[PDB]
């Protein structure tokens with residue numbers, strides 16, 4: 240079963256979603272973003288000193 | 289007790305029947321067809337195989353003219369060629385340089401391989417249907433095997449079974465069939481003694497060991513090349529070999545209704561066509577009186593989950609207050625839902641769990657647990673899977689029955705339309721009465 244959800248990008252706040260599969264008991268998933276890293280790809284122009 | 293019933297021919301799908309003998313506890317019988325075999329009666333028309341051309345050594349008559357006589361061999365051809373001057377390895381065969389003749393004779397015989405590699409051309413007649421059936425009799429699995437012709441009753445555990453006759457006489461085998469090793473083909477083979485060259489049946493014989501061989505291979509002797517002693521001929525190649533290369537697909541892969549085809553003997557197995565009348569003579573000992581069997585009251589039903597997935601996707605819980613410990617037989621009072629279990633144990637005030645399969649979008653049925661009918665209804669959900677490897681365990685859709693119990697939209701819209709119709713008709717009646725009154 241594939242469950243699709245959306246969570247705000249705020250770090251350290253858990254959000255809970257209800258996976259409701261008919262014929263089965265409801266399931267609750269708590270997910271928390273511990274760290275989101277944006278690493279840009281760098282092309283070195285030059286060096287100054 | 290004599291119970292007559294009809295079950296569809298689908299193999300591997302159990303079917304539930306109510307034995308309702310008044311004054312005794314209702315009984316539920318589960319019957320499942322394990323194998324249905326149609327074995328047609330075959331009369332061997334003939335045998336086709338590969339032929340061999342027998343060519344005795346040619347007769348070189350030089351300084352003279354040769355001649356031959358007609359023979360009664362299957363396809364005998366003889367000829368005399370004039371003006372031949374054959375050579376051997378040491379030189380010319382003989383002196384006289386012209387007016388020499390060569391006698392070439394050849395015939396067609398069935399090869400020894402006809403004993404092993406051959407195709408049997410048969411005619412088909414009525415089929416002797418047979419059946420193997422598994423019955424859940426009083427919690428015990430019993431197996432019966434009987435000819436499905438309305439006769440040949442079989443008694444197991446003092447219960448007598450009569451099966452058939454077939455509700456449909458359809459068989460995958462037509463009048464004329466051909467069996468090679470294990471493949472059965474439907475073809476209109478040529479009549480014996482009228483075979484055509486290069487096709488199936490160019491050489492024919494009544495039985496593999498028979499010496500009567502009919503051959504039509506269009507065998508024409510040709511003039512030998514100058515200076516050689518060979519015996520050339522123009523003969524249509526074996527029709528049996530060409531058929532072997534050009535067989536196509538047999539009945540095992542092209543039979544309708546999913547029939548399987550076997551040989552030795554030729555059998556059609558598991559043809560899901562028609563249905564089967566089954567009559568059971570039940571011993572009186574198997575029955576239990578109504579007063580002796582437990583009675584249940586104050587019972588309710590709830591469906592935690594329902595999915596029309598065709599593998600008993602619905603589960604129901606029935607709370608019961610049993611009069612005493614005993615065995616009863618759960619049965620559904622409607623065709624749309626089918627229950628996996630046939631008998632539950634009951635004791636005091638408790639609950640029992642049942643499994644069921646259906647095609648309804650909203651299950652609404654009445655389960656007869658034990659001489660007591662409880663109404664059970666709940667929402668059902670579609671399964672996420674698209675294809676499965678087993679046949680649907682429930683019944684067909686049924687016309688207008690599977691309307692989900694949210695069709696209250698249909699009732700409300702038709703009620704509004706009927707309301708405007710009734711108001712308009714009331715207006716028309718009022719004005720008509722007023723106009724008739726006015727003069």
Ligand SMILES: *[C@@H]1O[C@H](CO)[C@@H](O[C@@H]2O[C@H](CO)[C@@H](O[C@@H]3O[C@H](CO)[C@@H](O)[C@H](O[C@H]4O[C@H](CO)[C@@H](O)[C@H](O)[C@@H]4O[C@@H]4O[C@H](CO)[C@@H](O)[C@H](O)[C@H]4NC(C)=O)[C@@H]3O)[C@H](O)[C@H]2NC(C)=O)[C@H](O)[C@H]1NC(C)=O
Pocket residue numbers: 281282283
């Ligand atoms: C004290 O501490 C400081 C801080 O760390 C040190 O500074 C570091 O010094 C290192 C040594 O010079 C630096 O490491 C590398 O030095 C290479 C020398 O040739 C230089 O070429 C490197 O740059 C390439 O690699 C990087 C990482 O892969 C890339 O990000 C960078 O863009 C370069 O990559 C090329 O980019 C061009 C773009 O046009 C491409 O065309 C090429 O194909 C790319 N090539 C490759 C192989 O990717 C890199 O600088 C180190 O960077 C530097 N620290 C920092 C933070 O920059 C001091 O040295 C130290 N003191 C002592 C005494 O050592």
Ligand SMILES: *[C@@H]1O[C@H](CO)[C@@H](O[C@@H]2O[C@H](CO)[C@@H](O[C@@H]3O[C@H](CO)[C@@H](O)[C@H](O[C@H]4O[C@H](CO)[C@@H](O)[C@H](O)[C@@H]4O)[C@@H]3O)[C@H](O)[C@H]2NC(C)=O)[C@H](O)[C@H]1NC(C)=O
Pocket residue numbers: 331332403404405408467468469495496551552
């Ligand atoms: C190789 O294997 C194949 C199959 O696995 C096998 O084919 C069978 O050949 C026999 C010939 O020996 C066919 O005839 C059968 O032989 C028994 C011997 O006990 C006979 O009783 C029968 O022959 C009669 O059957 C006809 C039915 O009406 C008679 O009309 C006729 O007079 C025959 O004499 C019995 O049929 C047999 O039919 C085939 N089987 C099939 C499915 O075609 C073969 O024998 C094996 N051996 C060799 C060396 O190839």
Ligand SMILES: *[C@@H]1O[C@H](CO[C@@H]2O[C@@H](C)[C@@H](O)[C@@H](O)[C@@H]2O)[C@@H](O[C@@H]2O[C@H](CO)[C@@H](O[C@@H]3O[C@H](CO)[C@@H](O)[C@H](O)[C@@H]3O)[C@H](O)[C@H]2NC(C)=O)[C@H](O)[C@H]1NC(C)=O
Pocket residue numbers: 302422427428429628
């Ligand atoms: C009477 O026979 C029925 C069915 O007949 C059976 O057919 C074959 C499968 C062979 O097992 C035969 O020996 C046998 O007679 C029995 O019902 C079936 O029982 C089996 C038990 O092995 C069930 O298989 C189980 O299925 C569950 C759920 O899928 C699995 O978790 C298990 O691991 C196991 O595989 C099968 O589902 C069931 N079929 C039904 C109910 O339609 C019946 O048990 C038997 N009863 C007696 C008293 O002999």
